[PDB]
Amino acid sequence: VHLLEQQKEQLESSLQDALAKLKNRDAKQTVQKHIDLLHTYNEIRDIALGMIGKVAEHEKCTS
Amino acid sequence: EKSQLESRVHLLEQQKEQLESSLQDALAKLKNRDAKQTVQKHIDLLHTYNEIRDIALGMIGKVAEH
Amino acid sequence: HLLEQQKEQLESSLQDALAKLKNRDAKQTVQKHIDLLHTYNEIRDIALGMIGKVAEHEKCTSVELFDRF
Amino acid sequence: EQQKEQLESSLQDALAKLKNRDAKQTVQKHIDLLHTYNEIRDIALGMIGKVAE
Ligand SMILES: CCCCCCCCO[C@@H]1O[C@H](CO)[C@@H](O)[C@H](O)[C@H]1O
Ligand SMILES: CCCCCCCCO[C@@H]1O[C@H](CO)[C@@H](O)[C@H](O)[C@H]1O
């Protein structure tokens, strides 16, 4: 029963590879979504600093 | 001649008086509405500075959290 | 989740601030114009007033030259 | 008034910065939709290749 066992090995792997490939894409997409969210945040933070800076330099030229 | 030229000279003096009161009063009504407009630039800029200040704080209150 | 929660409340708040600030410059532009119109009407009225009086003076002189010459 | 430039502009730059971020994120969302579906088509065929075989 070599064809019987060679056949089943083919079957188990095609499921397992399918899963391995689907798991490793989401590994990559998720880490990537995180990084992308970090940069989105550094940016809106730097917008805040920016805006508070210009408010402080407006403030220090009246009384 | 002399009666009537004393009419004309009077008249003119009366006219000079009105013309100065007019230039006077135009310059007033102007300057005033000029002032009113400068107060308004200032108040509008106050409203703007607060709006942008409040959104700035908001962000700095939030980037505090994260 | 709040990628989108805090980004959109910000963006709304910005576009609004800008709306408001732009509305304020516009209101006060029509006001510059309304005021220029007020000043022009006044200067005009006066200047043409002076012109009428000198008009009347010129009529007198002329009437004098005629009843004379 | 030069102050009003500063402030207005600080709003206009904030909006600009993050209307653009979206633009770019949005094009990219599209490209990923396409690429992912090509990975799914291929996994599918992988299995079907090594089953019917
Ligand atoms: C009835 C009159 C009320 C006057 C209110 C004026 C408030 C204007 O507000 C402020 O005026 C300061 C000085 O002119 C400026 O330095 C500031 O930039 C301006 O925002
Ligand atoms: C591990 C190395 C990762 C490198 C970090 C990437 C640097 C940020 O590059 C990013 O590209 C984005 C694409 O959506 C643009 O939207 C942004 O403008 C920008 O911050």
Curated annotation (Swiss-Prot), chain D:
It comes from the Eukaryota. GO terms for cellular component: mating-type region heterochromatin; nucleus; Swi5-Sfr1 complex; Swi5-Swi2 complex. GO terms for biological process: DNA recombinase assembly; DNA recombination; DNA strand invasion; double-strand break repair via homologous recombination; gene conversion at mating-type locus; mating type switching; meiotic DNA recombinase assembly involved in reciprocal meiotic recombination; meiotic joint molecule formation. Keywords: DNA damage, DNA repair. GO terms for molecular function: ATPase activator activity; identical protein binding. Interacts with sfr1 and rhp51 during DNA repair. Interacts with swi2 and rhp51 during mating-type switching. Required for normal mating-type switching. Also involved in the rhp51-dependent recombination DNA repair pathway. Belongs to the SWI5/SAE3 family. This is Mating-type switching protein swi5. It comes from Schizosaccharomyces pombe (strain 972 / ATCC 24843) (Fission yeast). The gene is swi5. The chain holds residues 14 to 66 of 85 of the full protein.
